[PDB]
Structure formats: C-alpha cells, structure tokens
Design a protein around this nucleic acid. Structure first.
Lengths: 173, 38, 120, 140
RNA sequence: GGAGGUUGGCUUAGAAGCAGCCACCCUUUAAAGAAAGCGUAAUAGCUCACUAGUCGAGUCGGCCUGCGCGGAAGAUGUAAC
RNA sequence: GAUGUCGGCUCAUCACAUCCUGGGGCUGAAGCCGGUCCCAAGGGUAUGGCUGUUCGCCAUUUAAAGUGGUACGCGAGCUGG
C-alpha cells in the first residue's frame, strides 16, 4: 500500500494557510512552518488532507509520497517537540549547556564550544546527557549529528559521544 | 570499501543500493561486506 | 669539520690524534658544519694505545674552527686549527679531559657535560 | 529479560557449585551460579542425583528458577541402559555397542508421562529418539 | 513463542542451536529445523521457520526482448560529433 | 647524390599507473608502528667507493632518495672513456 492514500487528520486546532503553491501550518507550541510543492494536487477537507497527483510518471508517484510525509511532520512539530537523546561514554568526559552555548570536555587539548543555530534548545539533566528540543526533524537531526561527529565512538572501549541507545557495535582488543 | 567489477550480496543483511549512479552494497551487519563499484 | 674529507684533530684524552669528516648530519644536504654540530668521523691516526682503535666509524661534535663563530654583535671569536670531541652511541663524551679552550656558545640542553671539563 | 528456551546447563541435581561441567556458561545471563542451587534443591531424588543433570532452566531475577518436571532424565540414564559413559567419536554412525527398544521398556516406566510427554507410549518413543544423540541408534 | 526429552555425543570452561566429526530423530505443544543466521568464534540474547493478534488490497521470482558502458588509466593543448 | 650510434656534463618539459607531504573505507587496527585499497600532480625527490658503464653491490644519510614519455630529450651546447 502507498502512504499517499492515507490522509493527514490534523489534530486539535492547527491552522492551515494554503495558497495552492505554499502551504503554511500555524499552530500552538511553536508556529511558522511552510513548504512549497512542485506539482501535486492538494485538497482541503473538514479536518483531513489528501494529496492527489498529476501525470502518472515515476516522478509524480514519488513526489506525492514525499510531500505527504513532509506535511505530516509539520503537524506533529507544533504538536510535539522533537527530541534526541545523546549519551556520553567515557572517563573525563562531560557536557554543560550555558544558555545557548554547549561546551564539551572530550579529552582534547582545547575545549569545543558548540553554538546552537536557531530556536532550538539543548538541555543537560546530567553531565553525560543531551536533550535537543525543536520543532522540525531535519533541523533537530542535523544539530544532533554535528555534535556527534566531534568524537565518534570506538569498537575497543566505546569512548565517545553516542546517541539514542541502539547505535553501537564492539570487538575485543 | 572494496572496489570490484562484480558486486553481490554476501549475507542476508546486505541490500544493494544504486546511489548516484553507482552500484553500492551496504551491510547493516559487519562492515567487511561494504563494496563500492561494479 | 666544515665539509666532507676535512681532516681535523680531536680535543680529548682517550681518543685518537686525528680524524676525518665523512658525513655532515642534519638535513637533506647540509654542506657545512659550524661550531656546535654533529658530524660523523672515521679514525685516521691513533695513539699507540688510548681507547679508540684506528679505522672505526664514530660520532663527534665540532668545538673549534678557524672560520669562527659569530655572536649577535659584530664581535667574532676565531681560532686557528679545527677540533672535535668524540661521542658515544648516546651523545655523551668518551674521554675525561678536554684540551685547550672551548666557546661558551656550545652550552645547551645536552652539552653541559663537556663545558664542565672544558676550562674555557 | 532472557526469554528464549533451550538455555543449556549441566550441574548436579541439588548442586549448582560444580562449574567445570559448564564453567562461565551463565555469565551474560546475569545471575551468579550459587543462588541457582536453591532451585536445584527443589527438584531432587528423581533427576539422577549424584551425577550432573542437564535441566531446562528458566531465568528469573527473583532468586528463584522454575525447572521443567523431566522426572527421569535421559541424557545420561540412556548411557547407563546402553552400557557406555563416553559416546562414539561421531554419534549414530560410529558405534560402541548400541541400545535397542527391548531395553528401553524398563527405564520408561517412571516417565510421569504428562510432564515430559502427553501419554505413556510416546514417552517411550521420546527416549527412542533421546538415544539418538551419542552413538545409539533406533534399531528395535 | 519460538520446542518434549535434552547438554545432542566424543571433545573442549564452553563444542549446547552456532570446536572437528556429526545426530537431522521421535515428541509437550496454536509452533518449533535438538537450527537458518547473528550474537560473548563460543554462555545469553536477538531473530529467522514456522503458529495467535494487528493490518485490509494486491504481491513474489524467473523466461524471453528494445534502448541504456559500471567494468574504462599516458605522456606539447580541449583533442576518437 | 649521408637522418652522426652508447654513458657523463649543462638545461629542461609532460604523464600518473604516487616515493614524500595532504584528505580518508577496512584490518587478524590496544598505544607506537603498520598492511591494503579509493581521492590528490601543488612543491620536493642524497653525497661517495668500485666499473666505459646505464644497471648493480656496498658505506653513510634523509620527510623521501618515484616509474615512464620527450630521435631509449639534449654533439650547427660540451666531452670522447
């Protein structure tokens, strides 16, 4: 079955500002998300959305699935805050957020001072945990990746930053 | 990677992807199944 | 001394009387060696008995030359005759007593030994 | 925690202390070996005591391990009815003197036939195939 | 869930479903190959097989066949429309 | 009815199938070292003993002492072993 047939069913008072060319979702708990579609057909029902497609190519059969999952992510974003759990493994490692600055201790010679780009906040409930709250998956996921690539993990000790638990392999020395 | 002329699967976990015009093999298991060109 | 195949004597007691330069250590092709540099000698003429036998590859430091050393001034010290001091496998000297003067320009990290036995 | 059957363990019936029959065979399981013996003491006097007894163990973290009532065992007692201690170098095709169905009748009179079986006849047929491990065919 | 015996034997802490050689059975049982593969090579575990929900229309491999170079690196200057 | 042949000196220019430095999958990669394969031509790339020698074998270095094309580059530029 195809994901382009299932509707959106946007919950709890989410406002659509659709022009036909540039859909604009505005809700509570963060707002101002918008996308532009190249050529699909968007109908606007009583609480759901269906994405009809034009010319039956391989490239309109592929867009209507992509633009359905992108609109669905904007609905959940104003509904729920996207988060990523990053744990720290290793001795002498720590992290502490200072407002909008995330400064780390990774066993280097000089400490790294990572700056968050936009309206996206990193909270640290521990010295070995990061929680990155945002509104869109691609911008939460990009910032979580760039922190991870400071010190990627190791098959011999595991000594390096490591997000949501199931990522790791190992071997003996 | 391991540049060949004939790529193929080795275990049950290998999926063959054609990424940017080249036939790659990525393995969700053991990294020694990673094969580049073919 | 300052070139390959430069005969120069030693300033040492245990050694041989004359040695000859065969290789200037350092860079890719260092052509000259001033005062305070490591060369590699062959032993050309030995005392009837000392410690070092004739015809043996050793390692030495250069301590006196007739071209001179030049400090941060116009003022230069210029001897007459060339002179080396043999070293061990590790760079520490072989003999006990050093003959004649040295310069103060040689004293460094690794050469506080020979400037003790120097008198300058 | 550890939910899959055929978890393999051979220590004695009432006695979990001898490790060189298994060694570190229960390390990544999580539970140390000493507190198992309170569960081996709960199933004694029928499961070939004195000799090391292989038993279906079910791993729990509540300091208790329930075992399947396998009343008379067959991994070692079928060696006793055949006449060997150590089986052949390749079982069921290399032979040292095998067991037949004429000698399986006496040992299977104590099966407690719904605890490792359902009826009495197929528990004899269970120990028919339970000899098929170690150099003992089914010859009749 | 993922087998009844049952640690599948000689062996080796361990060879047990995953040393080497193998048994490849019969059976508790909606189900179970005393194992297909990972997993501490190996102990678990994850699964796979196969059965209960969940899901509510297609799905799966192969055979021929038209057009497409991945394989494809050289010496003065693009430089085998 | 003539296109002067080997090695040396002087001066060079291009290829990349990379010797060094630069970026990097995998490892039977603990660390220091490595092995192997993709990307990269910007600048570098030893003095001697012995032989007519290129080649080689040695002694001592160095970050490294690269493999080819250019009438086996170069005599109206030199030498003539």
């Amino acid at each position: 079955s195809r994901v382009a047939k299932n509707p959106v069913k946007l919950p709890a008072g989410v406002e659509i500002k659709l022009a036909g060319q540039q859909l604009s979702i505005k809700g509570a708990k963060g707002a101002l998300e918008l996308k532009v579609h190249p050529s699909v057909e968007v109908i606007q029902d009583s609480g759901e959305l269906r994405f009809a497609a034009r010319n039956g190519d391989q490239q309109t059969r592929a867009m209507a699935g992509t633009t359905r999952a992108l609109v669905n992510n904007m609905v959940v974003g104003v509904s729920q805050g996207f988060e990523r759990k990053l744990q720290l493994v290793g001795v002498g490692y720590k992290a502490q957020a200072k407002g909008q600055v995330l400064s780390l201790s990774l066993g280097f010679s000089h400490p790294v001072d990572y700056e968050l780009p936009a309206g996206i906040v990193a909270e640290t409930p521990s010295q070995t945990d990061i929680l990155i709250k945002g509104i869109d998956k691609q911008l939460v996921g990009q910032v979580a990746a760039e922190i991870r690539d400071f010190r990627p993990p190791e098959p011999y000790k595991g000594k390096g930053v490591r997000y949501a638990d199931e990522v790791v392999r190992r071997k003996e020395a | 990677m391991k540049v060949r002329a004939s790529v193929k699967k080795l275990c049950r976990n290998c999926k063959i992807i054609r990424r940017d015009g080249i036939v790659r093999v990525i393995c969700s298991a053991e990294p020694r199944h990673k094969q580049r060109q073919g | 001394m300052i070139q390959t195949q430069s005969m120069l004597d030693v300033a040492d007691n245990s050694g041989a009387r004359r040695v000859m330069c065969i290789k200037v250590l350092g860079g890719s092709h260092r052509r000259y060696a001033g005062i305070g540099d490591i060369i590699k000698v062959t032993v050309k003429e030995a005392i009837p008995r000392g410690k070092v036998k004739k015809g043996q590859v050793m390692t030495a430091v250069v301590v006196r030359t007739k071209h001179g050393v030049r400090r941060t001034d116009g003022s230069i010290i210029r001897f007459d005759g060339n002179a080396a001091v043999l070293l061990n496998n590790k760079q520490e000297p072989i003999g006990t007593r050093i003959f004649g003067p040295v310069t103060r320009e040689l004293r460094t990290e690794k050469f506080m030994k020979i400037v003790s036995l120097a008198p300058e | 925690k550890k939910i899959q059957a055929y978890i393999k363990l051979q220590v004695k019936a009432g006695q979990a202390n001898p490790s060189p029959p298994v060694g570190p065979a229960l390390g990544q399981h999580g539970v140390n070996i000493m507190e198992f013996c309170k569960a081996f003491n709960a199933k004694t006097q029928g499961q070939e005591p004195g000799l090391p007894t292989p038993v279906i163990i079910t791993v729990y973290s509540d300091r208790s391990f329930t075992f399947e009532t396998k009343s008379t065992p067959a991994a070692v007692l079928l060696k006793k009815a055949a006449g060997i201690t150590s089986g052949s170098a390749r079982p069921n095709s290399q032979k040292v003197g095998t067991v037949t169905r004429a000698q399986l009748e006496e040992i299977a009179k104590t099966k407690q036939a719904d605890l490792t079986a359902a009826d009495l006849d197929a528990a004899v047929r269970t120990i028919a195939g339970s000899a098929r491990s170690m150099g003992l065919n089914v010859e009749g």
